[PDB]
Assembly symmetry: C6
């Protein structure tokens, strides 16, 4: 919905957004939205996501697809009306994204998802990309483990000529919905096949916000299949745009740069990462 | 409708347009159209706006969508006939834009929306853009506050990987209609995802005029996701074209230029803005 | 229809075409076609024009849209057959353009629409364009007044972020049909939003001839939203092509060049225009 | 249909093709096909031509459109089967082009259409083009008169902002069919609006052969609306390709070059033309 | 179908393919498939070829189109199933290409179609192209005669502004099917209008193989209508790709180069051709 | 489905993936999935693959197309639900790829398909490409024989102007499904005609993973029909992307480089190949 502000309420909002990243307990936001989701009435649509065609499928709090749901409406504080209707396994009415309010008046944040190596990481979309054929896969997985911390991280595999990899876009989105609905730390191996169909385009556009709202982090690998020219710069551009945080390779081997958007209109941060390989290509991110 | 003129009536028109920006009390035009809107018969369509598909949805004076409305016509002074019909929540007949006359014979104006720091600002579409990754978001919000003055400004959020941001174009237009129907000062955070679908294209084309007619100002952020080359110049071009006023960054940090179209065939004005950051990235525009 | 010629009839045609611009009383052609139109049977389709989709709407001599009209045919001298049929507010049968013969055997002319400042001006399409952000709007209006002479000129407003401006293409064409059917001098403020949909493309293609045939002049503003490069030259090219006359800005401030096509295969003329601003940006074209 | 050859029959064919241009009486071929057409059964489809959409309309020997024609077939010498069927004013079955055999075994010719100034001219498509804004219209008309000789030439007007010009593609093709069915010399003023829709594309592809087969000549003006760069060379290229003969302007004023294809695999000829203007821009081609 | 191989069967295959070009009696393959075709049950579909739309028409051994054919299936050695069904004159089921097995286990060959001037020529698609406006038409016909030898060669005419030339793609494919079904040597004058519609694209893709399988040769003219730049090189590229043999012009007048693919994975051969003109542009290829 | 990991389970996965290529008995994975497939219930869909249109056809364990299959669902460990439904010979419900789990928890592998010349080769997609018109066909076949070892390799022929070659994309995919379902080593001669339709695009995207999952290797020829410029580098790029292993030609004649992806996030290997020709172009890869 839309929000109204004057100098005073605006200053309160910014402080709140600033706190959501800098002072809130890492992962607290995720815990909060988890509570919101489980309090939702059984059978209630909570998430709509677009499929390849452009239509969208709907899920409930248990990551189960909703096939039929008689039209229902809701009136917001803003005075706007939200309406949802699922028919024949497709959203007849409604919009893509979260179908229940997780944020409330607190919007425009990059909820702290985790803390590691002396740095706070934001939830939302995190694109790992840069100089082709580098160690992007090893890096997303190490990051997945580090940010998961005490928790296991979820892995969504898509579009790679390796065993067991799904290459059907509709299964892919189904995997993403389940992931964001049930896990704080998520890895998507190769966004290569997405970058275009309507559903695919919808994904670039919706994922970051969906994740940021849930308070989860989606760490996606994006190796520029394109040339080895300054075309990567265009990819890196289209990435800072659709991402909450960016992670790109550098001149120095094993080194990556992390560019984080800490929130709406807030300062963008940058810190470095040093990594090394161990047995069976398991990558480790040096902390201290 | 069309209007006829001879040297004398034309000179009267120009003086009137000139007055609408230079001498009218700031915000008076908004107040006037507000009165026109509330005098409208209950259930009467007042605004039609295109959705992604290209079809358009219709609203009444209370920003409530009209779903069914039996065909009805009206005969203008021009002799032309206006017809509106809504069926199944879509305009069966009519046109995009205001469905009731707010301007009358006084057209081609840039109604003064507010006065601040010794400068008058025009209503209509205001695009804030320029050298990528600058302080565009902080700037639209400060401007929102400044022009709102005694009033709160409305904020429409769209297409950013931040928490609570809607990424569905149809919700977006719904948010814009409600805003222009109820608030004089409006901020749209990121027009990035719009720039293309038919509805999106319709938006660039219709917004400025819809706002100018209402007498409200829509301050939209437009960070060129494109290259960091002279591609921004093309964006800045496509912006002077669809905007009533333009605000672009300069060589000097914190400094912006405001290019205003004061009205049909009237002189274009330019003045400078100096800004600075405070706590939690709240931007302040220096007045005196 | 098609016309046959031998050296002698051809010479008579050229003399007639030459006369239609050089010796006929300015505006006499308009008066003539007005008479032809009013003699048309009531309810008879006289003008068909394409809408955005590509379909076309039909009007009668009073600029009223025809919604239903049972198929009817006519046999020309050429032996060809003209057929018109309107159903559900759309041309089921027929062609775009004038649906009744206004020209007869006298075709390929640039009927003199007016005389001013010692120069004769042709009817048809007149595009005013050149070096971006110049005084194109002030210029079309001054021209509108000058060529209107004793008569008021009609103003069609479209696609500008100013108050009261229509931004819906279908209303636009409706405004153009009414204008050409009832006024000898017409101004279209901004063809910017047209230059593409089928209806829009149809417009560039049909307007000049429709106007030339009616004997009216359509003075359209065309500010190249494009770059500030030699892209304007391409616009200026696409303009000499679809126009009867061209008006472009020069190196010298306030000066414009008028390139006129005086008729089929006839000589193209060029003369200069000196202008200056007065109060409220009202432009004046210096005569003597 | 397809034809079989051995060295001997091939040599006979080439001699025949050579004769069709070099020794046959100018215009004899046209006379011959005229006889073939008038011997055709009444109501029999003889010519099919594509309209803008891609569908095609059918005509009889009197240039009257056929609206309904029950399926009918014919077996050729080749063993192939020709089938025609018209329903609802459109070819349900059949192909574009001549629907009755005018050529027989004698194909691949450029029938001499006329002789003038000591040169033989071929029937078929003749494109007049070159350096923009030159005297193309005056040139096609003089050529029309010269090649018409004792006969009047037919003039098809299309896509120019002049009075009486049709701008509807479907009327255009209707005009072309009637012309080729009834006149040996034809002028098409401006192919500018054709160069793209399916019908338009069909035209470039079919006209030359239709004309060559009939034994008539279609002299079309093609002023490159495009740049004033070496883009004209690309137009001149696309012209030698779809034309039987080419006529292009030179460095010298009033001078044109005529490049003629004398027949299948035969030598291409070139000769020069000197022209001058008289009263009312009537152009004259110097003979002796 | 698919074929299985080990080192030994593979070596047998290669020897067989090598034999099909180097030692088999020229034209023997054509004779063989002719026998296979005539042994086919009456009314049995034998060839399917795509029309402009993308659908395909079906023919029987006598080059007669099949309009209705009740679904029928066949089980191959490979275990795969072939199914054909024609309804309303279109392939409801089946695939493009030969509908009966002509090759068997012997695939990947370039059957020798003829011997002339001390060189063996392969069946399949032969594209004659190179430096624009050269003697391509004279060359395909001389080649047609030479390879036809004791037999007449068939000529398919398409897309040229000459008398009697078909310009309808559907008639064209109909002509090609009849040709390949009844003649060993075939000439297609101008593939210019094909190079794009689906049917046209299908043609480039299917012809070479259809011809190679039949054991006939299709000699097609392809004059690059494109620029006179290194764009011909791109055409020459797209030609080596879709052709069995390539024939291109050289620096020396009258000289051409013949690049032949002798078979699957086999060596590509090249030899030169010297030609000269006689009366009526009949070209002769010098043998001894 | 999605998989969850912590540092420990992740390390176990990587070791397992590493083992699938480095220590498992060559071809053991293929044998394993063969067992899984034959244990599948009769009539059960096991593989779905896209056809040109974009729809997909379904096969059972015997490579027989399924035409009708009443909707059926399955619940995975992940909690996700797999659903399949075939109607009118097309997948009404389901996804492209394997319809039964062959991998299980062991995903992201490059199963060793064979060992030869002291090197292990991975299953999945193998693209052979590089400097145009080289010995790509001889190379894929030698590789087919070498990797087949004790077994015969399967050969799928497509899009080449040679005898017996299928040029219909739908037959092609039918050939690929049968191959991957029944043979460990597969050769596809020319992917040239695929590189675009939806089905074709689906193929590039799905094949590698389908093969890797089955444990079979698809060796495809890809001669860049494109220029002879650095366009091949772009092809070589689009190839490393969709391939499990890459084989490209070098400066040295007969020499090729083999770039292998050994598994998810694992090290990429490179080794060289020396080859020579024998009789009838049979290529031999030098081992010792
Ligand atoms: N032990 C290692 N030492 C150095 N580099 C390694 C090691 N293990 C893996 N890599 C690199 O990690 C990458 C493998 O993961 P992959 O997903 O295929 O690559 P990418 O991130 O470029 O998409 C490769 O570029 C590979 O060369
Ligand atoms: N306190 C500050 N001092 C200097 N720059 C700031 C400060 N706070 C925010 N910014 C800048 O404001 C911008 C943040 O808002 P954001 O919307 O993400 O950027 P943009 O306007 O480029 O779209 C960033 O470019 C950030 O670097
Ligand atoms: N009094 C004036 N003196 C000089 N220039 C003026 C004056 N009044 C208006 N203009 C110019 O006229 C133009 C305003 O009309 P507008 O329609 O917005 O421009 P354009 O013709 O470039 O589309 C502007 O370029 C403005 O700078
Ligand atoms: N008497 C004349 N002397 C010199 N040029 C002339 C004369 N009459 C006409 N022209 C030229 O003939 C052309 C007019 O015909 P038009 O159809 O508009 O041009 P185009 O052939 O370039 O399409 C113009 O280029 C004009 O300048
Ligand atoms: N007797 C001849 N001497 C030299 N060239 C000739 C002779 N006869 C024909 N030609 C050339 O043969 C070609 C004619 O056949 P055509 O099909 O029109 O050409 P193309 O092969 O370029 O498509 C022309 O380029 C023409 O100049
Ligand atoms: N005996 C041989 N010696 C050298 N080169 C050969 C030999 N046999 C075949 N070749 C080469 O192998 C290739 C033939 O297979 P083909 O599929 O047509 O080529 P490509 O791999 O370029 O697609 C050709 O480039 C040919 O010149
Ligand atoms: Mg990766
Ligand atoms: Mg912003
Ligand atoms: Mg203007
Ligand atoms: Mg002309
Ligand atoms: Mg040719
Ligand atoms: Mg090959």
């Amino acid at each position: 919905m839309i929000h109204l502000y004057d100098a005073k309420s605006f200053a309160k909002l910014r402080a709140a957004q600033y706190a959501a990243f800098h002072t809130d307990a890492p992962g607290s936001w995720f815990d909060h939205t988890s509570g919101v989701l489980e309090s939702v009435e059984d059978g209630t649509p909570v998430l709509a996501i677009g499929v390849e065609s452009g239509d969208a499928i709907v899920f409930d709090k248990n990551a189960q697809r909703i096939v039929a749901y008689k039209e229902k409406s809701v009136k917001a504080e803003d005075g706007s009306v939200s309406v949802v209707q699922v028919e024949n396994g497709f959203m007849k009415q409604g919009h893509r994204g979260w179908l229940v309010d997780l944020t409330g008046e607190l919007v425009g944040c990059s909820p702290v998802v985790a803390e590691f190596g002396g740095h706070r990481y934001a939830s939302g979309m995190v694109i790992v990309t840069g100089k082709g054929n580098s160690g992007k896969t090893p890096l997303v997985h190490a990051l997945g483990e580090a940010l998961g911390g005490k928790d296991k991280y979820a892995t969504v595999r898509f579009g790679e000529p390796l065993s067991g990899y799904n290459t059907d876009f509709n299964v892919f989105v189904d995997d993403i919905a389940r992931a964001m609905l049930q896990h704080r730390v998520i890895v998507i191996d190769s966004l290569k096949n997405v970058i275009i169909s309507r559903g695919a385009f919808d994904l670039l556009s919706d994922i970051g916000a969906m994740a940021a709202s849930r308070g989860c982090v989606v760490i996606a690998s994006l190796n520029p299949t394109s040339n080895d020219d300054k075309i990567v710069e265009l990819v890196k551009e289209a990435s800072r745009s659709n991402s909450t945080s960016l992670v790109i390779s550098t001149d120095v081997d094993g080194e990556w740069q992390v560019l984080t958007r800490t929130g709406e209109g807030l300062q963008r941060l940058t810190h470095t990462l040093q990594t090394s390989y161990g047995e069976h290509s398991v990558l480790t991110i040096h902390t201290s």
